[PDB]
Amino acid sequence: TRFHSFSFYELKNVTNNFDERPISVGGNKMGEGGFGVVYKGYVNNTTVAVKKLAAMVDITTEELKQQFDQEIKVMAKCQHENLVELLGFSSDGDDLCLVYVYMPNGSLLDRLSCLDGTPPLSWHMRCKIAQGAANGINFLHENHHIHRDIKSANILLDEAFTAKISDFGLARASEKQTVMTSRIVGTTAYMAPEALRGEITPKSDIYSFGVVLLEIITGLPAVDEHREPQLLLDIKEEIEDEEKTIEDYIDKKMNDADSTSVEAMYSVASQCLHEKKNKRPDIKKVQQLLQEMT
Ligand SMILES: CC(C)Nc1cc(Nc2nc3ccnn3cc2F)ncc1C(=O)NC[C@@H](F)C(C)(C)O
């Protein structure tokens, strides 16, 4: 064993009975996803993030338990500066909690949208975050794991804006390697075409990272129901068809972006976004191209 086993009452005590008010207004709520809500807490003077798993999407209790077990297994095997650190968990009763080191700058998604009044990320910080995220994915792939849910909401940022990959509940270990599933899971706006069908491959993680690189350049979320186009990957088509340029989509909330490094990041993203999985570069090549960029 490597993680502290908490009793559920202890985590109820340290999160102020899972206070639903936002942290910005003195509550404990930091965010939510399809598989749970994240609360801020204090455990023995340590600031923690407590993910209470109770489902808000179409998932069964046994599927939640499988994702909880999967997260613990991946966390026990993978430790890296660009991966979040699991401190412990609670499993007593019908409730499941995962306890982590708190992330002072929350998620990349929230920082790109300046949620809660945080200042816009400079181009220089965006480049370092992209490099950190690729190093995290590279470590996971080297250790034969496929993330299956890479998105900006799953890239967290510490006090220094060091990128940290999170949410390993859907991660798959692969010794051999394309395989199939009957339960399609993930965020549609980021998912590779084959992943949307049910294929499981490390090449899908590359496609999803390409979408993240477009959110970093543009400051636009991957999907926006009230936007034209609603899907960010459609801008790649508009740019490829010469109807627009990447310069027309650069986030206006920054003053330090230069055309050379922006075009270089866009080139990495377009390569990641090849329709044909085998045309996409491997994570070590993505890592190398992002290093050449700076
Ligand atoms: C729930 C996500 C969006 N927000 C966090 C996750 C985390 N920690 C973790 N959360 C999760 C959720 C799943 N894995 N995971 C790993 C983690 F280490 N820590 C802090 C925040 C958080 O919101 N911090 C506050 C800052 F954004 C501030 C600017 C001051 O509002």
**What ligand 1 atom has the least distance to the C-alpha of 166?**
14
User: Are residues 88 and 139 both part of a single domain?
Assistant: no
Q: Same domain for 183 and 229?
A: yes
Ligand 1 midpoint to CA 30 (Å): 6
Question: Which distant-in-sequence residues (6+ apart) come within 8 Å of 120 by Cβ?
Answer: 114, 219, 251, 253, 254
Which technique was used to obtain these atomic coordinates? X-ray
Choosing from 19, 94, 110, 149, the catalytic residue is: 149
List binding-site positions. 30-38, 51, 151-154, 167
Q: Are residues 73 and 117 in the same domain?
A: no
Helices of type H across the chain: 8-14, 61-77, 108-112, 123-142, 193-197, 202-218, 234-240, 259-272, 283-293
In testing the pocket of ligand 1, which one of 32, 38, 42, 84 has its CB within 8 Å of the most ligand atoms? Answer: 38
The DSSP secondary-structure symbol of 37 reads E
Residues 164, 86: one domain?
A: no
Report which protein residue has its CA nearest ligand 1's atom 29: 105
Q: Are residues 286 and 214 in the same domain?
A: yes
Based on the domain organization, do 166 and 283 belong to the same domain? yes
CA 149, 155, 156: angle at the middle one, nearest 5? 140
* Token pair recorded at residue 85: 């650190």
Residue with tokens 């009230």: 226
What is the C-alpha separation between 230 and 221, in angstroms, rounded? 9
Residues 212, 198, single domain; the answer is yes
Q: How far apart are CA 149 and CA 116, in angstroms?
A: 25
Whether 106 lines ligand 1, by a CB cut-off of 6 Å, is yes
Question: Which domain-ending residue is among 56, 77, 102?
Answer: 102
Structure tokens at 21: 């008010």
Residues 6 and 65 in one domain: yes
Q: Look at ligand 1, atom 15, and give the residue with the nearest C-alpha.
A: 166
> Which residue, of 53, 68, 102, is where some domain finishes?
102
**What is the CB neighbour count within 10 angstroms for residue 8?**
16
Residue nearest to atom 18 of ligand 1 (CA): 100
**How far is the C-alpha of 126 from the C-alpha of 3, rounded, in Å?**
32
Both 87 and 112 in one domain: the answer is no
Q: Dihedral through CA 217, CA 229, CA 237, CA 189, nearest 10?
A: 70
Resolution, expressed in angstroms to one decimal? 2.2
Same domain, 139 and 67: no
Contact 15, 50 (CB under 8 A): yes
Contact predicate 249/263, CB 8 Å:
no
Q: Please, which residues bridge with residue 146 across strands?
A: 172
Instruction: State whether the beta carbon of 247 lies less than 6 angstroms from ligand 1.
Output: no
Residue 118 neighbours by CB under 8 Å, 6+ apart: 105, 110, 111
- What does DSSP say about strands 29-33 and 155-157: parallel, antiparallel, or unpaired? unpaired
Query: What is the distance, to the nearest Å, from the Cα of residue 260 to the centroid of all Cα atoms in its chain?
Result: 27
Q: Which atom of ligand 1 is nearest to the CA of 102?
A: 19
Q: Which residues pair with 50 in a beta bridge?
A: 39, 99
Q: Are residues 43 and 14 in the same domain?
A: yes
- Binding site feature residues for ATP: 30-38, 51, 151-154, 167
Q: Is the CB of 41 under 6 A from ligand 1?
A: no
Residue 128: how many other CB atoms lie within 10 Å = 17
* Spatial separation of the C-alpha atoms in residues 175 and 125, rounded to whole Å: 35
Clarify whether residues 231 and 198 are in a common domain. Answer: yes
Q: Could you give the number of structural domains in the chain?
A: 2
Which of these three, 78, 102, 126, is where a domain ends?
102
Tally of CB atoms within 10 A around 116: 12
Q: Domain containing 97: what range?
A: 1-102
CA dihedral 51, 21, 28, 149 (to 10 degrees): 30
Helix (H, G, I), strand (E, B) or coil at 269: helix
Specify whether 95 is catalytic.
Answer: no
Instruction: Determine the Cα–Cα distance for residues 100 and 51; give it in Å rounded to an integer.
Output: 8
Both tokens assigned to 94: 């019908």
